[PDB]
Amino acid sequence: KVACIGAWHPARVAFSVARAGQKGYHHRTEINKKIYKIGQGYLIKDGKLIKNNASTDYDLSDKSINPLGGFVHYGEVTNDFVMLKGCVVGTKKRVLTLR
Amino acid sequence: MKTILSNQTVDIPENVDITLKGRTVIVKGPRGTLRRDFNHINVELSLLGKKKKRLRVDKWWGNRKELATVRTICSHVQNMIKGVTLGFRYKMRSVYAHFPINVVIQENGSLVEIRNFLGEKYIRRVRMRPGVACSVSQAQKDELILEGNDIELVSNSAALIQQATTVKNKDIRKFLDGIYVSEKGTVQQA
């Protein structure tokens, strides 16, 4: 708890004192997230699909951005993707607005 | 006490032909033209002559404070007339004890930049007023030579580049460095 929620006078609780209530699910805008990669989706090219959008020029493996077993609580990413540095708001499957 | 009448007349040479659009003095001479409005002062301006063209200015029931603005108008008009026939010229020396202040003039005399003031790395860049052209002299080793028509723009441009070279956090009874206005002259010395 918060032990004191205000003095005697003003004879009211001010708006600045910590109170209990809703946590999370608030709209937030955070800035200066750097893009690290704009990834290409699975495209079917010569009859069989090219799936190497997590390859680098140092790795050269034929692997997708999907971890083994897929992204947890999400699914798999077959479309174009953006790789941002760090953490962003929301759960998995949250629609993000990126401007 | 409010004085019934306080006038002061200004002689105008034959080079300049000033006009009066109300309380706006448009002076026009060989070095260009100038313009100020005096519509923050309640006076009457009138051209007098037909051959010599004086300029009077009257106040009509002024108190003491209003009676001071008459001769200021006359002094501003006379600095317009000196500005469009002779023009204004400020020579300012660069004083330094150890680190030579390097001034190089940027685009067509509109911007100066000052490199080595007290031996430091930040580069002062101070823009002149519109109409003031700065220059580096050839008569002496290090003086700026900036010049123009209007006195309140030539003088402001010297004040910007003098307050740009302020010594901070030191005693300024030693450390006398900076660029300081050395004389207030004219072009076309009569």
Place this chain on the structure above:
Amino acid sequence: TFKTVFAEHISDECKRRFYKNWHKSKKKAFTKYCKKWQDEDGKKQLEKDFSSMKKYCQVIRVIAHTQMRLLPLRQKKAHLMEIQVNGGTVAEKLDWARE
């Protein structure tokens, strides 16, 4: 907001956004609207609504939507968004958006 113009063929994943219950509806949204792209008296209404929007508006915003059938999610209802168009004059950014 001055004037809004929609396209002729809006897909069902975007038309699903306009309903609270897709399953009980008769799917009638933008059906009287789309006929004025194949009309003449309603056709001439459209380019008057572009040219007035060309001569009054200062801000243009395109109305775009995602396409949820490429995503592995349960949701089929797409998300609409106004994305504004920077750069150029208003007449320049308008016929860009019509293409």
Place this chain on the structure above:
Amino acid sequence: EVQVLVLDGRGHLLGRLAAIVAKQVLLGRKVVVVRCEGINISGNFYRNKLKYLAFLRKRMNTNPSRGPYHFRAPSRIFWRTVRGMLPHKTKRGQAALDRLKVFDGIPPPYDKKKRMVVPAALKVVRLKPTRKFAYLGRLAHEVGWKYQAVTATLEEKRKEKAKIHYRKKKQLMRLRKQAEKNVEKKIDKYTEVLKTHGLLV
């Protein structure tokens, strides 16, 4: 008298115009005040800005969302001065205060109507010319009014449509004067009756 009263706000002192408006609104009399950026306040600018910034500090510190509502447009600063001259806690003063419409700039119901001027509230009448004054449009800009640039671009657009109106109205005035010389042998009888009884000097 059922029409509204359209007052130009420009050149008028704030509280001299407000006592004029507040007495009319209590006597019936719908009144519209347009162009509230032109309203002047006497005393130099910095002095009057401090009185608004001193007002911006009065807020209920327990919950300032309940507090004094500090309106920042020039039309809504003027609207609170005339409210302070009204008995606005009663039904009579609340029914007064909605006979008053205030506007920034001149909106398109009132741009094609001729404005009135109250001479007992003008700056050129009520101040000595060597006294400093301020503008309500400038002072609202430094306290947080978002829109003096867009309101200035719409006032300069209104005026150039209004110059075209004037020089066409004035073009008909010299055709009417041209007509009075064409027809003067057939209206000399009627211009004698009007000149006898005090019309037509």
Place this chain on the structure above:
Amino acid sequence: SGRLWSKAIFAGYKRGLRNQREHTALLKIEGVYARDETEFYLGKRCAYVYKAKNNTVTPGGKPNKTRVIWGKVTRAHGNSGMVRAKFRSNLPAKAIGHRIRVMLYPSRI
């Protein structure tokens, strides 16, 4: 044809600051704003014409739903127009800021 009465505003009752006397009304006649300009009006009949829900009788016609409270202008009030008026029954406070007719009956012109 024509208006034939002069239009006036019901301003308020004869009052002090913290007392009002409802038996005397205060009127502002449009057009007169000085006390020397108000001697014309000092005996004139005056009416407060209003409408209500039920029909009442009309002298000289079928039952309308207009009703009248009649009064007289008795004296001047102040230095700028503003006569005061005595009505047969006191004016309702609903009427404050509405129209009162001033009539040109009993004449002295």
Place this chain on the structure above:
Amino acid sequence: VFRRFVEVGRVAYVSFGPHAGKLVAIVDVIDQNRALVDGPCTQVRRQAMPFKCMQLTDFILKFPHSAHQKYVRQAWQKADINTKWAATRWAKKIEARERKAKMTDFDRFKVMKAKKMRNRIIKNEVKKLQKAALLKASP
């Protein structure tokens, strides 16, 4: 600016006060506010008047300051001020302004019919003058 000056001999027009509507002449000046003032031919005996009552005209008489009554009377009579006034437009505007006020109910009727006819001809004529200015067919 400032064509009309308070000086000795300046003829003023009294705008309000008890002597309202009378021409009068400035004889001497007192203390920035008042003026010694005399109308010998307009029934205003010599007295003091504030300058805010009086409105300056264009007429100046020639007599020295604080002369007696007879020297401002005869300066009034030659270069006759009473007949130069009531020939200016400003005395004509006053003459028209009061005869509009002393206009009876029947004279307002005769003016109403006359002005209604007079504006029919003028309005008819400007229809013709602006449709003849409309007959223009040049690039």
Place this chain on the structure above:
RNA sequence: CGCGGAGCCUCGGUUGGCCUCGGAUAGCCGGUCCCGGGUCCGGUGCGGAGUGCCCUUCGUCCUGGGAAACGGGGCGCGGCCGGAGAGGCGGCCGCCCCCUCGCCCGUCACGCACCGCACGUUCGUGGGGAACCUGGCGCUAAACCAUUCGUAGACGACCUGCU
């Protein structure tokens, strides 16, 4: 879409309009000749004036003279154009269609002339609500609950899915 009709219910105010320069104030306004200017000419206790201007309403019939004749009138049709700050408005044309009347000054007589007496005169086909007849032209939905979801959750709310 009609005023198309018939009646109602209910809320009342109101008693002719002004359709627009921008501004200056120790200065303004209006015309004009030469390249929006300079000249020039006027006005300025603003008369090209809000201390103003415009509309004016007894109705008709006899009958003349002026103004007119390039006109008037149509919720006449058809087209065009202007206006976005709250456009909610304002124009210009083409064809039809009736009227030579309406505006001033006159002849000529007439209308409940209701017998001294109040709420008369407008806006106004006002607003609002129901019901009816008459025509045309049209139109055929969602929302909530239940259900499912878990990006949500104390409960409601929110996010979802269902030939």
